[model samples]
Target chain A: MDVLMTQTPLSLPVSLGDQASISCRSSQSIVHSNGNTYLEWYLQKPGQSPKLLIYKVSNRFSGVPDRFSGSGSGTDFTLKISRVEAEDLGVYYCFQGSHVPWTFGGGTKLEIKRGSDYEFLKSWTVEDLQKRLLALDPMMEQEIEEIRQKYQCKRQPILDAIEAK
Target chain B: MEVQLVESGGGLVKPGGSLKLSCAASGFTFSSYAMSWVRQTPEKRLEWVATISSGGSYTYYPDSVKGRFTISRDNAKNTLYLQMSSLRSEDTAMYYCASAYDGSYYFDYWGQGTTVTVCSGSDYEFLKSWTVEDLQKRLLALDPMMEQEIEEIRQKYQSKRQPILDAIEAK
Candidate 1:
């Protein structure tokens, strides 16, 4: 609790469409050629669960765009999101390479300067949270958002969507 | 599918008498799948006991498993049972039965839980009378101890403070 409450805040700045780098490390080295990076990168927007952006840095999960990448060795690592999308506005986090039970970075927030419909959605707070949480990682956005939205909107039975299609 | 694991309380039975525990599965194919049993102590550490197929009752035990622990299956109503004899206080822990699948490769799902209390002498009533509330009380009493133990664990490790340095070096 003291670690969270008495912590000094860090500032990270990123411009739209430009490459942004986020670094993470473990007390011990997380280096391994085996496809598992004990470290994970996440983004948590207000009112949403944290989203996983990268894991064991460098190896992108399925469906992740090439623009988003991770690279590092040992305890030192970096997460870079190139050409941030409109949906990419949110906070980012870095989790250790070690499997659960684990630790996470407080997070870094990426905000959209201002707009009409975009800014209006941001002002809604809940919408901002949902989008940010969704935007954290390259994958899972469509699947997670559709499931949640279908549940919220009640357009059709969720189970029906799960059927062979 | 619902898998109900039922364990009986002692009732002054002789030391050589048998202890019968049952796990019943409802909703899915029983024999074709795998089922598991886990034990948890008050200290909150969990240990895997066995995995058995609902079919002819073949069982797999971890290397650490010992003593008179046995798992049997009753196919009539889709049930799985665990039996143990010569009970001891160290065996007093919460047991949960769940499906064993290689996909998650871990106990991603769990049963509601059945608590077993072991005691010396022939008093089954006290152990039998133990209820869920007793478990809750025991967990509440042990919370502070859990925190203390966690602190001690962190302090005892040389690399305990590595996360902070990792963050600094990462930056």
Candidate 2:
């Protein structure tokens, strides 16, 4: 069964030098019987792989900035960034490593408030992307047609033999 | 850390046929940690298949693939294996063998994926006689739909990031 993320992290409009905290809640307790919570926090900047920040609850991964801290146990967890920077306007994901199949929280996108020195990416939600994709419906049909043509061309000899039979 | 994956059989398999994929961990002690076999499709989210401990002590599979899928390790080979029976078209995906951190469940090291395709009888017969080189060649010859889909996603994000990139560059 998929691990449910009961708490939705805030999509904060953060300012530079301001304190920011995001919380994640798991459907089941992340604390293992061994007196440890399998919760970890990751920051995925645009176009980059997910970087491990906090692991085993409170310990920061090597070289992770001190401003980032992790806390809490059981079902509730928090990721606190003491001083936010313009570079921090990316999606954050909380992962639970305590179970057989590790699960990830729905990503929370950080938007820099408008009029900031550095503006974040355009504010387009999931629905906006879906609406834009509707424009590709015709192109998708063309691609499907292209796939059929390519497959037919590759199998031309076998197809011809089968037709003759 | 590098985790090498070697699929025992070719990527092509027939419906109801069996296939096995393996991963070998290096630069790390396998006996102390667990390995996971995960898969993903171009259009779908990632799915967890199974996990096998390094010492072959415990094996686990998600409920989705519990009975039909087997997770095992060859201590002698220092490798973990994911074997599937009664394969279907839905089984086709990019399979990856990954290793978790010693004390954590997050997969820190992952192997390059092997693309598996479950095909019809004739296609299966054609693929069964393939060698590793032949399989690679066939993989290269496949359609570009997957690549196109990935490229589309990248372009979508690229467009979204253009203004941000411009701002950073101006600063």
Candidate 3:
């Protein structure tokens, strides 16, 4: 490997809203003569290619949340999540364009950390799980309606499609 | 709610040709969600192509295709377009359109991909046209393990090439 990008902590399990950090290091300097590093960070979720997160070391891609930030220079870099959101579960990769041959880092995977709150569920019988699921159907509907209203969703077309299904 | 993203307007083209693909969205407020186009190469590696932010307010393209690729949309018709010019041999691939939710920044829905083949000749023609420096640079971008495999294939084929040549000479 002419230029190496390294990322440790292969698997991370974090609770919702918790702070998270993924570290990256390069074998060569990524800084250009103009003083801008060519390092960029991306997130690749399931079944999809990576979406740009941060570019030029610290600049956030437009529309990306402020919670995600990048910092580093030369051969070292860091990606931080100030408060991890539910949709943050995915693999993060670092790519560097500072060299003639663009290089990619080994990805770091982020997933939800199951806490003790779910411990009791594992001991439950199959019938118990089914009953709980049945009860949640009504509650889920109530919350779903609230979510639709909160987002001001235009539900007609979607409802029609669902009906057809 | 069911969301659908439909792809259209992809077809055959020559190297350095122009093409445009359209993605139409339904079952949601199309303008409220950001849309992106991704292409999968023959090697099965997927690369993000371009994206238009919600309401078509902003557009982003990667360094690889920024100059040759363009993103446009009509929120009124809930349609988006990927306009590409100066397409190269590597641009032949399957294109998929997807929508991203506002807050989560995740792709929530995908369009069935549209395949486009950029017509070109075999390896003989490619070797005649391709620059050795460019090929070496591209090889460097490939995974080291993958490069090793290619090396082994070259050796294996070279060992086999002489036998076939001798058979033809004997005939």
Candidate 4:
């Protein structure tokens, strides 16, 4: 079973050298039998694959700067950047390793802006990334209509063959 | 400097068989960074398989593959190799070689993955044909004891088990 992982503040705007905090909550405690919590945090910059920033909840992964601090345990966890740089502007993901079929949180996007300008994105907690994808566009309807037309066209051929028989 | 990992050498193998894979690195000082292998299973589970340190000083593997897998490298060639044996269907996965600068461990550069699929030649069809009830019957037959039998054995072995439990607590 997938352990539900969710992150708050789907987007945040921060100034350079400012602190950015993102919170992630799990459906259950993430502590493993080894006495280590199997929570890790990752940053995925635009056009690049994700990179690990923290492991076991707090330990910085290799070459990770001291600015990234991971803390908290149990159901709730946090990743705090003491000095957010422009390079840090991207989507941050919290991953849980406590259970197999592990899961990654809906990402929190970080961007450079005045703190007050985009705090609304910060206030919006992403409940489920998949849930937000339910809208159908005009193209979707158009394609469905096209498929409907194809079905009628194909049916006409079969009906003609049946009548000839 | 740019970095890249390229994976090769993996294919289908039967259960109780073996497979070997290779990963080559480029665009950076190969010996100055660590190389690691990560896998995503058919069921979509991701796992870190193993690692080799820069300078070939150390190697690491998780308990899942510790006994059946081996990792070796040729620093001069800028490549690391993974060899595993006694494979099972659970071992089937897409193994992507990854690497990063040496330290607490994270993969920053990743190779396109190589695939490993372990097929069970003898029992694949047979296992699929069995009923759930039939499978449960065989499982029950293979189990050790019943309620009375377990109770009796535990009573007889209580003295021997207590010390182990005490040591677990380090009492």
Candidate 5:
């Protein structure tokens, strides 16, 4: 059976030293009979193998920095960074070692807000930007809404097909 | 720093018979990590069957494949083995051995996949599995979700980057 895993805030914009948290929600339980949560987290820099961050729910792999933390059980899980560093700019994926043909979350891209103006914009919440975008261009607001709906519609068939299996 | 997968050997299996597929993990301490066995059916559909820890303390198998597939390891030899019993006509596929880390789920490193086709009588039939069309339909059912996610990232970043670019240019 196909299980869906998702990470919220698909794109994370942050400055150095900022704290970030990405949540990966699974459609099914990743808990094994051994009473261990089979969830793990990884960081993938472009053109590189995925580096293991956290495994078995909360244990850090040897040599992983202390700032990277994972917590959760069953279907809900979260990976948190106590502080963002320049080197942390990359896609973070959460995977379930509990299931076979193991699955990964869609991934969260950690984008570094480099310039002072960009840093200022980063201070605004995603909803804030959504509102600003609405006022800046009404057509953009409509377009984004349509895109969101279109994306949801596109995803429904896959969910139905997998759940059917 | 890197993990590798190498098949030790291959052989044919008859119905109700068994064979062992050996995979050696090199470039890393085999007892310090985890390993798994995955298979791609003749139709190219991927299935995860079993996994064992580096030290052989814990082993996991998906319920669907547990009875016919057994996963084991030899720490001294740094080798992992996939032993299949009661081989069936549909057992033909390319089997892969990969590295799995504790608390993490992706197969970080993969062995060059080996093809294992089930044989009947004096001849082997590689044409007895699912069709590409069926596999494509199964795969396509999973594609839209991934593509939608990619599209979301692209649009979100493009719009955000445009404003940042404009602001920087104005300065």
Candidate 6:
């Protein structure tokens, strides 16, 4: 049997070069404070699918950068993004590994633009990515243009594809 | 870091012949691991059928591995056996044997995967040939999609300065 309930979303946003934190709590405590640690944190950037960053809670997966880390006990868990870079814009999800019937958090989104001088890719919001994508891909141009005129907000369907990759 | 997976063919039988699929282990102990079997569809939805641990603890993922999929391990030979009676094409996902870091938990080390294609009838009238590539191709396919998605992920990656610059420079 499952219960229908509302979960409080927590967030602590910081600018580039600052620390960013997000937290998640289970409706009922289902995490293990010390037992098997299986917590994982994922980062899904624009035009890309979610990548496993922090595995087993604190252990980083192969090739994952050191800037991403997970530290928490039981139901109280924290996903920390340090020195948040412009390339770190996207939704982050937390998954519990210590228990069966595993579950994931709805996740938090980081909306930050990188202010740099490299003249390379700048931090573009989720919206900026979509506009550029539609322009590059002919098939999406018509639909995205119609959406830009209709809603004037960032598009979400693109995020699903981005996360799927 | 290199892993090898071998299965016992279970001598052939005629139509309606009973068979057992066993995966032998080497370089890793069967007493310290969780072996998993997953299904891969060309469409990209990889399904977790079931997982069994070194301690004999077992669990299945919903409707994925109901009846017809039996998982058991043998300590004597360091082998894991998967027996499927009345096989069919829908049962086509490659079977893999793996070990976890905890020896009884999630997968940290994986096998190359062994494709188990069974003969047409249960009478043992046919032989199901196993192809490693069928499983290999699917697994390899996951990397490129991952790389492209990760390559342009920076916040500035989506910035339209290039397009704007091209437009201005065109004149």
Candidate 2 lDDT tens digits, A1-165: 557764465587775578888888998876666767778776654323345678888988877788889888778888888998655656777877667566677767765566644333244343433433343444344344334434543443344334443
Q: Write the per-residue lDDT of candidate 1 for residues B1-171, one digit (tens) a residue.
A: 553444333222233345666666666676666776766554433455666764754677644444577877777777777777766656656676765433222232355455555434433334344455553454455546545654554454424334323333343
Task: Evaluate model 5: give its lDDT.
Answer: 0.68
Q: Is candidate 4 or candidate 5 better by TM-score?
A: 4
The CA lDDT of each predicted structure is 0.51, 0.64, 0.68, 0.68, 0.68, 0.51
Task: Work out the TM-score per prediction.
Answer: 0.36, 0.61, 0.42, 0.48, 0.46, 0.42
DockQ score for candidate 4: 0.02
Kindly report which residue stretches of model 6 are placed more than 4 angstroms away from their true locations once superposed: A1-18, A31-34, A45-50, A61-63, A114-165, B1-49, B52-59, B63-100, B103-171
- In angstroms, give how far residue A35 of model 4 lies from its true place: 14
Q: Pick the candidate with the highest DockQ.
A: 2
Q: How many residue pairs clash in each candidate?
A: 8, 0, 0, 0, 2, 22
lDDT of 2 by residue, B1-171 (tens): 654544444366657888887776566667677788767544323566787776777777767688899988876667877888988777776677777675654666566556566665454435455565655555555547555664675576567555555544454
lDDT of 3 at B138: 46
Worst ten-residue run, lDDT, model 2 chain A? A126-135
Per-residue lDDT tens digits for candidate 3, residues B37-153, read 877665545566887898887987777788999999999999999998988878877788988755443345667667666655333333334455554444454445444554565
Give candidate 4 misplaced runs (Cα > 4 Å): A1-39, A43-50, A53-75, A79-165, B123-171
Provide DockQ values for all models, in the order shown.
Answer: 0.02, 0.14, 0.02, 0.02, 0.10, 0.05
What is the C-alpha lDDT profile of model 5 across B28-68, one tens digit per residue? 98887888886755443455678887788888887666788
User: Which ten-residue region of model 4 chain B has the weakest summed lDDT?
Assistant: B162-171
The predicted structure with the larger TM-score, 3 or 4, is 4
Candidate 5, residue B24: the lDDT equals: 80
- Candidate 3 lDDT tens digits, A19-100: 9999999987876555657777877654344567887888888778999999987678999999986567778888775554
- Clashing residue pairs in candidate 2 (N, C-alpha, C atoms within 3 angstroms): none
Error of model 1, residue A8, in angstroms: 23
